Scaffold this active site. Structure first.
Site, PDB file in Angstrom:
ATOM      1  CG  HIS A  14      -6.588  -4.519  -0.455  1.00 51.62           C
ATOM      2  ND1 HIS A  14      -5.301  -4.439  -0.957  1.00 51.62           N
ATOM      3  CD2 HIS A  14      -7.282  -3.512  -1.042  1.00 51.62           C
ATOM      4  CE1 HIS A  14      -5.228  -3.417  -1.797  1.00 51.62           C
ATOM      5  NE2 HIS A  14      -6.430  -2.865  -1.910  1.00 51.62           N
TER       6      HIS A  14
ATOM      7  CG  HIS B  39      -2.819  -2.992   2.667  1.00 50.31           C
ATOM      8  ND1 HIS B  39      -4.171  -2.829   2.468  1.00 50.31           N
ATOM      9  CD2 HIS B  39      -2.194  -2.221   1.763  1.00 50.31           C
ATOM     10  CE1 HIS B  39      -4.350  -2.029   1.442  1.00 50.31           C
ATOM     11  NE2 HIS B  39      -3.155  -1.651   0.988  1.00 50.31           N
TER      12      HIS B  39
ATOM     13  CG  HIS C 247      -7.802  -0.375  -5.871  1.00 50.02           C
ATOM     14  ND1 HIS C 247      -7.045  -0.158  -4.724  1.00 50.02           N
ATOM     15  CD2 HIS C 247      -7.680   0.757  -6.612  1.00 50.02           C
ATOM     16  CE1 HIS C 247      -6.505   1.049  -4.784  1.00 50.02           C
ATOM     17  NE2 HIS C 247      -6.876   1.625  -5.915  1.00 50.02           N
TER      18      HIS C 247
ATOM     19  CD  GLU D 124      -6.149   7.258   0.935  1.00 51.09           C
ATOM     20  OE1 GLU D 124      -4.999   7.080   1.477  1.00 51.09           O
ATOM     21  OE2 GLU D 124      -6.331   7.856  -0.139  1.00 51.09           O
TER      22      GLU D 124
ATOM     23  CD  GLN E 159      -5.963   1.479   0.356  1.00 46.19           C
ATOM     24  OE1 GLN E 159      -6.306   0.429  -0.175  1.00 46.19           O
ATOM     25  NE2 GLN E 159      -4.783   2.061   0.096  1.00 46.19           N
TER      26      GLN E 159
ATOM     27  CE1 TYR F  63     -10.676   0.061  -2.374  1.00 45.90           C
ATOM     28  CE2 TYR F  63     -10.209  -0.909  -0.268  1.00 45.90           C
ATOM     29  CZ  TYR F  63      -9.756  -0.353  -1.457  1.00 45.90           C
ATOM     30  OH  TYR F  63      -8.432  -0.130  -1.728  1.00 45.90           O
TER      31      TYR F  63
HETATM   32 CU   LIG Z   1      -6.770  -1.517  -3.312  1.00 40.42          CU
END
Ligand SMILES: [Cu+2]
Ligand SMILES: *[C@@H]1O[C@H](CO)[C@@H](O[C@@H]2O[C@H](CO)[C@@H](O)[C@H](O)[C@H]2NC(C)=O)[C@H](O)[C@H]1NC(C)=O
Length: 223
Positions: A84, A157, A1, A30, A166, A168
């Site tokens: 991450h 991960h 995050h 995702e 993930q 971002y």
């Molecule tokens: Cu995260």
């Protein structure tokens, strides 16, 4: 995050959310087929910003990543959790009006990437341990005009299956001055450039331990 929440240009930070379309929440996208993969979006909420940041072609800008919008430090936990691990990536897209263009669709070209080096250290780790600084060179050879800059960190991960990876990302609004226009990039679409079967998206990074990583998307554009 994590959130890319401000941009540094000519050594000066342009302000929280100023010229960067920031989400309120720091969770990932995702689904690589979602329109939200371009400049973030649903089920997050992304703010608009009227600022368009002038940058000189051929200089570096620095994306500043922080855990939350309200984060004030620059230590590792103020940037992103050390679990991450993954690449950092940046793309540009030429648009007619950077304050209003959505980013979705074709026109993106990759300008920076940092995957896993020969020592096993990931691009995200260099940002986490480098005060959140993600340095990106604006090519000197592109056409001047308005562009969106999409800066991205992918955490792998939990990416052994898809969905898992993930994503971002945030988009900054640029006015690129001084480009020579000498070279025209080939472009890709978001959504479209990433697939759930890509070897850099569906990947078990620990078992067996990876020795090379293929960053998703097109090759880096160079002058
Ligand atoms: Cu995260
Ligand atoms: C400008 O950004 C580029 C990336 O777009 C940086 O280039 C990387 O620099 C590291 C050293 O810190 C090298 O290991 C990589 O090989 C470089 N990548 C490329 C594509 O050259 C560059 O360091 C940045 N420049 C400044 C002044 O911050």
């Amino acid at each position: 995050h994590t959130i890319f929440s401000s941009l540094e240009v000519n050594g000066v930070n342009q302000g929280l959310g100023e010229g960067v379309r920031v989400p309120t929440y720091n969770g990932p996208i995702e689904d690589v087929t979602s329109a939200s993969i371009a400049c973030n979006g649903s089920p997050n909420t992304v703010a608009s910003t009227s600022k368009v940041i002038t940058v000189q072609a051929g200089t570096n800008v620095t994306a500043i990543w922080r855990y939350m919008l309200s984060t004030t430090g620059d230590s590792p936990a103020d940037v992103m959790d050390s679990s991450h691990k993954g690449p950092t990536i940046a793309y540009l897209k030429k648009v007619d009006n950077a304050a209003t263009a959505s980013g979705v669709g074709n026109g993106w070209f990759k300008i920076q990437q940092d995957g896993m080096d020969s020592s096993g250290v990931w691009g995200t780790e260099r940002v986490i341990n480098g005060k959140g600084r993600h340095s990106i060179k604006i090519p000197e050879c592109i056409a001047p005009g308005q562009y969106l800059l999409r800066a991205e960190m992918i955490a792998l991960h939990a990416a052994s299956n898809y969905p898992g990876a993930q994503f971002y990302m945030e988009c900054a609004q640029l006015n690129v001055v001084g480009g020579t226009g000498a070279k025209t990039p080939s472009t890709v679409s978001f959504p479209g450039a990433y697939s759930g079967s890509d070897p850099g998206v569906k990947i078990s990074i620990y078992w067996p331990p990876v020795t090379s990583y293929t960053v998703p998307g097109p090759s880096v554009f160079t002058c």
